[PDB]
Amino acid sequence: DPAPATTFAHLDATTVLSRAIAELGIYPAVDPLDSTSRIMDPNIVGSEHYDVARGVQKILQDYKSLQDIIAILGMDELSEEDKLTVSRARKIQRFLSQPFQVAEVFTGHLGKLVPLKETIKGFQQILAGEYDHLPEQAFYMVGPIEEAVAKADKLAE
Amino acid sequence: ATLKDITRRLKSIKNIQKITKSMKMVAAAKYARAERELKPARVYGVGSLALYEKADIKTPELIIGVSSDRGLCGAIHSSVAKQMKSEAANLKEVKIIGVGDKIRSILHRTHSDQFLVTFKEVGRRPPTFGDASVIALELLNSGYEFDEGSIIFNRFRSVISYKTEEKPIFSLDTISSAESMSIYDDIDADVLRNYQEYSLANIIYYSLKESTTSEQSARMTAMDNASKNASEMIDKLTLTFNRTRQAVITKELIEIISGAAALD
Amino acid sequence: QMSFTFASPTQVFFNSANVRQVDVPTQTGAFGILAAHVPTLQVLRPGLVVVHAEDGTTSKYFVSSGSVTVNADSSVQLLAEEAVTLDMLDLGAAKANLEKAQSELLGAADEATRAEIQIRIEANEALVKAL
Amino acid sequence: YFRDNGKHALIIYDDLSKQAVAYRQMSLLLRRPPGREAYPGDVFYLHSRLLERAAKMNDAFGGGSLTALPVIETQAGDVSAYIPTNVISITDGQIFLETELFYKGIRPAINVGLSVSRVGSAAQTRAM
Amino acid sequence: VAYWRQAGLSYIRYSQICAKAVRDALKTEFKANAMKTSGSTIKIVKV
Amino acid sequence: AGVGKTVLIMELINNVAKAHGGYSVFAGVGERTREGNDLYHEMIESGVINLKDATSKVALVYGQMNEPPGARARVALTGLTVAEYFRDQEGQDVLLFIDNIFRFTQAGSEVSALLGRIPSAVGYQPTLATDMGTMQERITTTKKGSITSVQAIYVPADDLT
Numbered sequence: 001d002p003a004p005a006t007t008f009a010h011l012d013a014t015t016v017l018s019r020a021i022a023e024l025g026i027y028p029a030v031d032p033l034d035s036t037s038r039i040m041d042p043n044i045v046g047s048e049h050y051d052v053a054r055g056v057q058k059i060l061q062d063y064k065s066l067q068d069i070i071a072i073l074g075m076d077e078l079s080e081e082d083k084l085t086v087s088r089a090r091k092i093q094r095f096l097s098q099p100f101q102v103a104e105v106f107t108g109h110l111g112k113l114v115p116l117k118e119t120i121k122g123f124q125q126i127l128a129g130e131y132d133h134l135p136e137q138a139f140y141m142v143g144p145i146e147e148a149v150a151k152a153d154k155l156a157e
Numbered sequence: 158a159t160l161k162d163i164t165r166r167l168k169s170i171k172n173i174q175k176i177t178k179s180m181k182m183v184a185a186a187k188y189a190r191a192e193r194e195l196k197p198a199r200v201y202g203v204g205s206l207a208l209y210e211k212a213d214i215k216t217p218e219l220i221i222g223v224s225s226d227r228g229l230c231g232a233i234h235s236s237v238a239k240q241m242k243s244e245a246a247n248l249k250e251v252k253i254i255g256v257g258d259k260i261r262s263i264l265h266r267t268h269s270d271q272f273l274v275t276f277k278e279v280g281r282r283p284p285t286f287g288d289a290s291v292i293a294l295e296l297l298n299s300g301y302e303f304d305e306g307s308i309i310f311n312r313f314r315s316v317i318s319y320k321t322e323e324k325p326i327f328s329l330d331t332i333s334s335a336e337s338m339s340i341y342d343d344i345d346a347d348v349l350r351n352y353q354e355y356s357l358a359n360i361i362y363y364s365l366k367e368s369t370t371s372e373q374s375a376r377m378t379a380m381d382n383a384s385k386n387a388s389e390m391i392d393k394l395t396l397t398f399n400r401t402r403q404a405v406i407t408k409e410l411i412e413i414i415s416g417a418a419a420l421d
Numbered sequence: 422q423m424s425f426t427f428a429s430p431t432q433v434f435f436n437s438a439n440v441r442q443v444d445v446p447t448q449t450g451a452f453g454i455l456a457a458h459v460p461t462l463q464v465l466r467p468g469l470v471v472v473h474a475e476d477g478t479t480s481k482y483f484v485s486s487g488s489v490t491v492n493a494d495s496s497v498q499l500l501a502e503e504a505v506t507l508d509m510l511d512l513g514a515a516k517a518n519l520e521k522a523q524s525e526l527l528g529a530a531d532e533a534t535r536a537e538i539q540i541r542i543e544a545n546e547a548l549v550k551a552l
Numbered sequence: 553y554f555r556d557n558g559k560h561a562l563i564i565y566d567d568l569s570k571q572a573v574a575y576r577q578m579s580l581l582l583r584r585p586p587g588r589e590a591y592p593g594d595v596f597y598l599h600s601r602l603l604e605r606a607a608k609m610n611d612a613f614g615g616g617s618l619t620a621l622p623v624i625e626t627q628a629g630d631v632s633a634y635i636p637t638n639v640i641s642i643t644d645g646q647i648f649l650e651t652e653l654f655y656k657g658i659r660p661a662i663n664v665g666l667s668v669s670r671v672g673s674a675a676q677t678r679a680m
Numbered sequence: 681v682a683y684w685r686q687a688g689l690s691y692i693r694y695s696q697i698c699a700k701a702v703r704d705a706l707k708t709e710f711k712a713n714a715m716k717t718s719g720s721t722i723k724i725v726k727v
Numbered sequence: 728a729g730v731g732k733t734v735l736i737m738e739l740i741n742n743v744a745k746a747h748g749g750y751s752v753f754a755g756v757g758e759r760t761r762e763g764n765d766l767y768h769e770m771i772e773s774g775v776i777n778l779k780d781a782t783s784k785v786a787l788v789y790g791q792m793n794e795p796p797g798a799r800a801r802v803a804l805t806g807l808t809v810a811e812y813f814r815d816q817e818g819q820d821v822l823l824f825i826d827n828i829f830r831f832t833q834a835g836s837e838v839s840a841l842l843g844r845i846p847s848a849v850g851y852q853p854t855l856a857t858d859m860g861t862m863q864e865r866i867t868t869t870k871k872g873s874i875t876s877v878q879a880i881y882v883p884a885d886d887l888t
Contacts, residue, residue, distance in 0.1 A: 510706060535687075
């Protein structure tokens with residue numbers, strides 16, 4: 001649509017919220033694959049952030065790729081590292097779900113603010129596979145990754 | 158993408174779908190057959206083991222596993238692949254036997270050496286007892302002599318289910334010649350071997366047939382799944398289609414007229 | 422009594438059926454194990470299997486091979502590699518086979534080959550039993 | 553004429569697609585509203601009367617006929633297209649021709665399934 | 681016997697010759713049916 | 728199509744309009760004169776039209792493709808108008824066999840364009856709703872009869888969204 005189409009030029013950061021993500025109830029409901037800032041770059045934001053993000057961006061992306069097959073066609077016609085990424089992407093997915101403190105009316109949850117490190121680290125860890133044996137709901141509606149672990153434990157009963 | 162693309166997809170996807178059913182029912186038919194055969198077989202392999210485990214069987218102080226040729230019949234094969242790969246360390250000459258041509262690169266690539274034999278035509282035309290004997294006979298007449306031994310196959314449980322089963326293979330005729338087993342014998346080292354033998358074929362057959370049957374159903378399933386999957390998916394697309402389709406149409410009339418016969 | 426389990430891979434005829442006895446041309450011998458009977462394994466010859474079914478009926482069979490498996494218990498299991506009911510077997514052939522067989526043996530140089538013939542000879546003969 | 557003279561005539565309209573184009577063009581140039589797919593509406597009507605003029609006359613009309621063999625050239629199989637849809641709704645069937653077979657050799661190469669005779673069949677041959 | 685068994689020969693082989701001789705045996709179409717059993721195609725992979 | 732369509736229809740006429748002392752109207756909008764011709768003979772044949780009754784049981788009102796739009800466009804309304812007499816006045820449960828609102832719809836729009844009107848979306852007459860509204864609303868059961876309406880529906884593109 002031309003309007004949004006135009007808009008981008010005038011932007012510096014776009015938050016495109018994904019109807020799908022939203023639809024997954026995930027709140028953050030983002031279309032993270034177009035919630036962006038041009039000002040993403042190791043140069044600017046330090047590479048760690050950047051890279052991790054790129055690893056993520058990627059991870060989702062690859063994952064994205066599969067989806068079309070899997071959609072009718074499930075797994076095992078895929079390798080399990082693909083599964084790993086998928087899962088990770090999924091954990092991550094859930095991890096982006098980060099509750100809403102404001103809208104306890106909507107959520108009941110209290111929402112989180114994640115100071116950056118828990119984020120950078122957070123993903124580095126999941127990526128590190130450090131989370132890759134936890135229940136995915138652990139990341140679901142959490143902010144700081146530790147809490148996801150905490151949440152994991154209890155979700156692990 | 159555009160209706161084209163979408164259709165390209167759609168088109169092919171049905172084709173697939175159709176195909177997917179084609180593979181499916183053929184397999185299901187095979188399945189039907191597979192069931193039948195399972196009757197004498199059922200007995201038969203079950204029998205072997207009810208000698209072996211009329212009594213029980215033991216080890217001294219080899220494995221064999223079997224599966225199909227193709228995938229897309231679930232990960233049926235992967236299971237045996239898995240479960241024999243798990244084994245081997247302990248052993249006690251080592252051999253593995255993977256009959257299977259799925260077990261062939263899901264397992265003939267590790268034990269591609271420590272395999273004793275592998276058989277092909279592992280399904281993909283209907284295998285029979287004859288084959289079990291075939292595969293049996295020379296196997297004996299081998300130089301890897303049997304140390305340990307388990308037979309891993311997909312034991313069918315119902316079409317819906319198999320559990321990759323395992324048995325012990327104690328072809329090693331000193332299992333037979335020994336223990337209480339010799340006390341359940343009550344007659345010499347001929348028939349000992351020649352049952353150990355005979356029963357090995359029975360089980361081989363059986364196990365195999367269970368496997369293949371499992372496979373047969375698993376392929377059905379795999380082929381099943383898909384043709385359903387396709388169906389839903391079509392359903393979404395076909396809209397997306399339309400929508401863009403009219404969207405277009407309409408919209409062009411706009412540009413054509415009043416959009417460009419606005420005054421044009 | 423005996424639960425007689427009669428099968429070939431291919432055909433299961435009686436399955437732990439209350440048969441009185443089966444007299445079995447095991448390579449082992451022809452013995453008529455009735456009912457239960459100690460653990461014993463006997464390997465099935467080719468012969469005819471006579472299934473004294475606990476009822477005065479005896480079903481006839483040719484057994485070719487396999488093993489019968491003699492539990493301790495009542496259930497005795499002929500698992501004949503080949504077991505066929507005599508019904509489907511063929512004299513024209515039996516003789517015919519035998520002739521041939523006998524022809525072959527003679528050139529079937531080496532114990533194994535001769536054997537193969539001999540087995541066969543034996544076989545045809547064992548058909549010839551019933552034929 | 554023939555139709556009315558008992559004579560059985562065959563007109564093959566070969567092909568109307570190009571005509572339609574022309575016609576549309578004609579409308580538009582006439583300013584005169586066109587319509588669908590930029591084509592005028594009564595390009596249907598146009599043909600409808602025409603094609604209604606292809607008909608099987610009774611005996612009063614000598615039993616004649618004017619059989620109309622329209623041609624439509626599928627433009628990439630497109631028929632969804634307004635006029636074909638028109639025509640489709642008009643016809644007494646359409647005889648779908650398919651390439652693949654042609655390429656197969658298979659000449660006739662038709663897709664019979666897609667071929668249709670809505671009516672044709674009160675006019676065959678027991679033998680057949 | 682042993683002219684085969686002590687020709688070694690798999691017991692399977694024996695058996696299979698027997699059975700094969702049965703397959704060899706049988707009447708008419710019955711004998712057709714022989715071949716069923718002698719699915720034995722089983723490709724000879726061998727490592 | 729002609730899957731004893733007509734036959735069935737004829738049979739339906741039989742089943743109700745006979746049985747229940749109904750009435751029928753057939754409005755042939757944009758059909759083939761030939762098929763209607765055929766239909767005639769069918770109708771004769773069926774005896775729902777009798778050549779012996781110019782008051783048989785079915786009025787065929789035809790505004791075949793060969794007409795200019797307006798005629799085809801009106802032929803349903805026309806018929807409707809008859810049926811309303813028949814409904815109210817003749818008190819009847821009219822069966823109004825309508826062939827074929829789609830072609831009607833189509834016809835309506837044809838003029839919409841050519842009338843220089845803007846036929847609304849997808850090309851279709853902006854008044855599509857109101858024309859319908861009034862039409863569909865012309866149809867009903869009153870305190871008098873019913874015009875029970877049987878509408879042939881050509882399904883554009885097997886699509887109907």
